[PDB]
Design a binder for this molecule. Sequence first.
Ligand SMILES: C[C@@H]1O[C@@H](O[C@@H]2[C@@H](O[C@H]3O[C@H](CO)[C@H](O)[C@H](O)[C@H]3O)[C@@H](O)[C@@H](CO)O[C@H]2O)[C@@H](O)[C@H](O)[C@@H]1O
Ligand SMILES: [Ca+2]
Ligand SMILES: [Ca+2]
Ligand SMILES: [Ca+2]
Ligand SMILES: [Ca+2]
Length: 385
Amino acid sequence: SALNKAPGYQDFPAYYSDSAHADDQVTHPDVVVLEEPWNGYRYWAVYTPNVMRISIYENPSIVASSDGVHWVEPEGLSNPIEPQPPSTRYHNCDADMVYNAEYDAMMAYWNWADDQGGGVGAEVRLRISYDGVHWGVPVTYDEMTRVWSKPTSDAERQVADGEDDFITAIASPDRYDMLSPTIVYDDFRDVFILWANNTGDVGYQNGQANFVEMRYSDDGITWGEPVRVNGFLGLDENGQQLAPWHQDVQYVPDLKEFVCISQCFAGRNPDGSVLHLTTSKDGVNWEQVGTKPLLSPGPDGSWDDFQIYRSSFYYEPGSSAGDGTMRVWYSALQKDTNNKMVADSSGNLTIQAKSEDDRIWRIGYAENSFVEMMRVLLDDPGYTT
Ligand SMILES: C[C@@H]1O[C@@H](O[C@@H]2[C@@H](O[C@H]3O[C@H](CO)[C@H](O)[C@H](O)[C@H]3O)[C@@H](O)[C@@H](CO)O[C@H]2O)[C@@H](O)[C@H](O)[C@@H]1O
Ligand SMILES: [Ca+2]
Ligand SMILES: [Ca+2]
Ligand SMILES: [Ca+2]
Ligand SMILES: [Ca+2]
């Protein structure tokens, strides 16, 4: 196996309470792993609750951990960090978070859509935090200039964190052309990079017409014009082209390259999607690693038996160069779940799925040696970095 899935899944809290849906359904994690603790913890994650049929609960939420396994809501934090929309016309999705070393602050991005055709389109929005508890607009950010000035005291390391306290990073008049934004700070060129999937004004059924675009920014706040990446995905084991749905990118210093885990598909839409691995020296020009999937749905009846959904990763360096560990927080869905018993996070059959749970959404974990992963992907038992 390219990655070894951990048994069960991880417990993430979801704020919602809805009688027609099992609690604590969640997707699309984005994890930040640090060398040293930030506001008490070395692991920070943003994620969104989600259920079938209604997207209104899909609101950026934060947890922290000391281990990447057991997640807690920091003391004083109220999830979601971005409020529930006022109606089902609108929904949030697709969170991704970066640690900004210069400001010693987290930058949490997400996608907001007006889903009404002929509506206003969509936006990539941003809330920043200094303390891990309050997420919003820095008090030394000037909305007129869009400049985030570095704090010059502890008192300036504060945010406004009300319901309207976000930054619009990007706007588009189409609804679905900036899906799954993923941000990396390139410390060579000294620029923020954001990759997103362009599904036009169509979305989930756009399919093989999907393509990824990148944008550049000096600060992470104001972004330039998009340009298409090249070579993002390749052929699968049948020789069939893969198309993007959702993705996470990392710059990996130990590998001297950008690495991306892509939730992708060979058919008409992301049903049954798998993960593939793709890499790039520059962020622009990519090549898929092997023909084989990095992660696939589990067997019938498993919590991940429908599709693998958007996943986040960290390359943990080893003691030797080029010999690290791939750590993957993967989201997934189970099919055919209405009124059925489903697994808890320990893998025990203790949860009753509810009447409108057509599927169940959870976040779990998988891991492998980077070298062993590459050996499986490339069908090369002797690969070494
Ligand atoms: C309930 C329904 O939910 C959303 O549509 C889902 C769709 O959601 C994904 O794709 C749309 C674009 O088509 C957005 O990017 C979402 O952030 C994605 O999660 C898929 O799940 C398809 C699967 O068949 O089902 C649609 O109903 C939302 O766009 C709708 O407005 C509505 O809220
Ligand atoms: Ca999404
Ligand atoms: Ca990320
Ligand atoms: Ca091209
Ligand atoms: Ca190609």
